[PDB]
Design goal:
This is part of a larger assembly, with chains A (about 350 residues) and B (about 220 residues). With about 350 residues, chain A is α+β, with helices and mostly antiparallel strands. Chain A is built from 5 helices and 18 strands. Chain A has helices at about 35-50, 80-85, 145, 255-260, 325-340, and strands spanning about 10, 15-20, 25-30, 55-60, 95-100, 120-125, 130, 135, 140, 160, 175-180, 195-200, 230, 245-255, 275, 295-300, 300-310, 320-325. Chain B is built from no helices and 20 strands. Classes of the chains: A alpha+beta (about 350), B mainly beta (about 220). Chain B: Belongs to the clostridial glucosylating toxin (LCGT) family.
Chain lengths: ~350, ~220
């Protein structure tokens, strides 16, 4: 009962802790009574975050559902999720909110230092090949086509964080990647499920210039056309190369029913893919921005939407770019972090 | 400029002054950078670069790299710039015998062809005197060295999302091609097979699936 009756999930933009109820086949929140920091740490560790704990507090219930996995005290030194049991309603009037890692905060054309602390550059043979996105001190998200077949040893890659100038990414100064994990479903032709995990050999030290980017929690309600941003080293000019500077471009999401139209991609886009162009063109991703982060701001937190997959003109819009859906893979990401622990 | 106190002649080339070594060009101008000394290449660094060294004085500087006006060098334990193949941190670099700079571009060597960028062989497809070639990692085919060009005939190559196709001569094709009944197009300036959306080729419109195969569309 470890692939069901022991699964916890944070929910919503407010980080509402939940526990699965096999008896009723549902996700339920947890009442705040009897709860302390220790069970918050246990719920974080179970979720693959290991020792990362940020804050837990009670928040007035807003989802509206009337049911709770109430905790026990006299059960003994047993599994934490051996205790959580159902109840009609607690008297504390508060549900638990649990943040396992501080993320999604940045300092307030080219991008200034500390504006995208979660951006990294990946160096195969001293040359910028793919970007990335920090999610924890020792895990970076990128694409599967970056690390496929010929290039798949962790000994080929190296990461640079907090440095803005490609000229300033010296040899022997990056972070060595100690493992490369590609999604098993990844299909080299359709590039479906194009996401890879690249575990660094040493943890990243977080400061004003280096910081994580939060993962998409379930139930985010992305509006039809958000206002995202795209970052990475590329070339705004076509027929270009890896830009000397890190840039950033406002991009607008595109509905999958429009992006799969026959003027755009005629069903090329699968459920695990996301489009984000910009009307009037003049802005999109580009080479060297493949494997880079697409992020948005909702409820005061920078969220990770996806990572770059492919395009057909790259600032020649009416053929916009495509990114993998981080939300869909988040459970596999959690599993991979959990097993490695 | 330095003039000999005895003969008043301007110094040229490697010169030792008050036990301090300096280099002067053919015009007698003191130079900063790397030049060949009697025992090998030496670095005449700016002032105060090491132990309050004077401007243009050779400084002890080996067992680390050197970036100077986009040029790359490396000095061994003897403070002399290294040339030829050298294994640094389990990686091989090649430096020009004449100048010692890091290698750049296609460079045939002893029957093995590479494509250097700042002295480090690169992986992938890069144009050479005959065309493009699959410069591949080590031991990818017949005990080939790291980045050495390898024989890759009549089969596709996928690399960072780039789909190349090679012919019988182990050179990547370009322009229109037909393979196993599937019509392709490969960008002439990169040999990258167009893929994934409408493309403007020869002043027309062509749609290619992300496998790269063309879509007729009439």
């Amino acid at each position: 009962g470890e692939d069901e009756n022991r699964c916890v999930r944070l929910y919503g933009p407010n980080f509402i802790l939940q526990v699965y109820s096999s008896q009723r086949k549902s996700w339920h929140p947890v009442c705040q009574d009897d709860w302390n920091e220790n069970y918050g740490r246990a719920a974080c560790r179970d979720m693959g975050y290991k020792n990362n704990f940020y804050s837990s507090q009670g928040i007035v219930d807003d989802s509206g559902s009337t049911s709770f996995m109430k905790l026990n005290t006299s059960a003994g030194n047993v599994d934490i999720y051996k205790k959580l049991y159902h109840s009609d309603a607690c008297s504390s009037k508060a549900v638990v909110s649990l943040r396992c890692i501080a993320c999604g905060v940045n300092l307030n054309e080219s991008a200034l230092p500390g504006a995208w602390p979660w951006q990294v550059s990946l160096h195969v043979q001293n040359v910028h090949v793919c970007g990335g996105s920090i999610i924890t001190p020792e895990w970076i998200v990128t694409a599967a086509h970056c690390v496929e077949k010929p290039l798949n040893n962790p000994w080929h890659w190296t990461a640079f964080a907090g440095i803005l100038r490609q000229s300033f990414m010296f040899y022997g100064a990056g972070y060595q990647v100690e493992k490369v994990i590609s999604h098993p479903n990844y299909d080299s032709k359709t590039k479906n499920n194009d996401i890879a995990l690249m575990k660094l050999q040493k943890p990243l030290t977080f400061n004003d210039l280096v910081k994580p980017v939060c993962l998409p929690n379930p139930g985010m309600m992305l509006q039809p056309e958000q206002l995202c941003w795209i970052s990475g080293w590329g070339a705004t000019e076509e027929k270009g190369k890896t830009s000397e500077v890190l840039n950033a471009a406002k991009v607008l999401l595109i509905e999958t029913q429009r992006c799969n139209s026959r003027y755009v991609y005629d069903n090329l886009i699968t459920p695990a893919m996301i489009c984000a162009g910009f009307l009037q063109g003049n802005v999109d991703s580009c080479q060297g921005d493949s494997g880079g982060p697409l992020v948005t701001s909702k409820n005061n937190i920078w969220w990770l939407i996806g990572d770059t997959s492919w395009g057909s003109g790259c600032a020649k819009a009416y053929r916009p770019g495509v990114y993998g859906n981080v939300m869909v893979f988040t459970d596999w990401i959690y599993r991979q972090m959990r097993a490695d622990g | 400029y330095y003039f000999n106190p005895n003969t008043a002649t301007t110094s040229i080339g490697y010169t030792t002054i008050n036990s301090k070594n300096f280099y002067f060009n053919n015009d007698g101008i003191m130079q900063l950078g790397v030049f060949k000394g009697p025992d090998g290449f030496e670095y005449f660094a700016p002032a105060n670069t090491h132990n309050n060294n004077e401007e243009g004085q050779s400084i002890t500087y080996q067992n680390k790299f050197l970036i100077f006006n986009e040029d790359v060098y490396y000095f061994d334990s003897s403070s002399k710039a290294v040339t030829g193949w050298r294994t640094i941190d389990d990686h091989r670099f090649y430096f020009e015998p004449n100048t010692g700079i890091g290698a750049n571009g296609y460079k045939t060597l002893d029957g093995k062809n590479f494509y250097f960028r700042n002295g480090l062989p690169q992986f992938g497809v890069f144009k050479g005197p005959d065309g493009f070639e699959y410069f591949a990692p080590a031991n990818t085919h017949n005990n080939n060295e790291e980045g050495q060009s390898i024989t890759y005939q009549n089969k596709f190559l996928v690399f960072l999302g780039n789909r190349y196709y090679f012919d019988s001569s182990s050179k990547a094709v370009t322009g229109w091609q037909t393979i196993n009944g599937n019509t392709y197009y490969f960008m002439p300036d990169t040999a990258i097979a167009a893929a994934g959306g409408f493309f403007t080729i020869d002043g027309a419109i062509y749609f290619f699936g992300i496998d790269g195969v063309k879509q007729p569309g009439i």
